């Protein structure tokens, strides 16, 4: 049981890695997008 648990957590490490990277990338893209909407509002005014 301990061995199987260890193996499953090793497998789930992949999911955690990808999730972390994707959420981080998304955050930076959202920040850039907000910057773009800010400049767009500045011009539209």
């Amino acid at each position: 049981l301990f061995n199987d648990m260890e193996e499953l957590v090793i497998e789930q490490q992949e999911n955690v890695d990808v999730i972390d990277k994707n959420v981080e990338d998304a955050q930076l893209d959202v920040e850039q997008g907000v910057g773009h909407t800010d400049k767009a509002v500045k011009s539209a005014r």
Binding site: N15, A26, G33, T37
Partner: protein, 60 residues
């Protein structure tokens, strides 16, 4: 009596570990879904960035 106590403790720990295996199966399930949704989130964030940039250029 010491050996019987040891056996009882080992049986209890086997039960707890069986429970843990079921829980880690549930954790893997929560994680396969969250990885896919974080992918969706990344795609949507990029799309939002690009759309906002296109509107920025339009207003300019």
């Amino acid at each position: 009596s010491r050996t019987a106590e040891l056996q009882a403790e080992i049986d209890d720990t086997v039960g707890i570990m069986r429970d843990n295996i079921n829980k880690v199966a549930e954790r893997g399930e929560r994680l396969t879904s969250i990885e896919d949704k974080a992918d969706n989130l990344a795609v949507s964030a990029q799309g939002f960035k690009r759309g906002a940039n296109r509107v920025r250029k339009a207003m300019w």
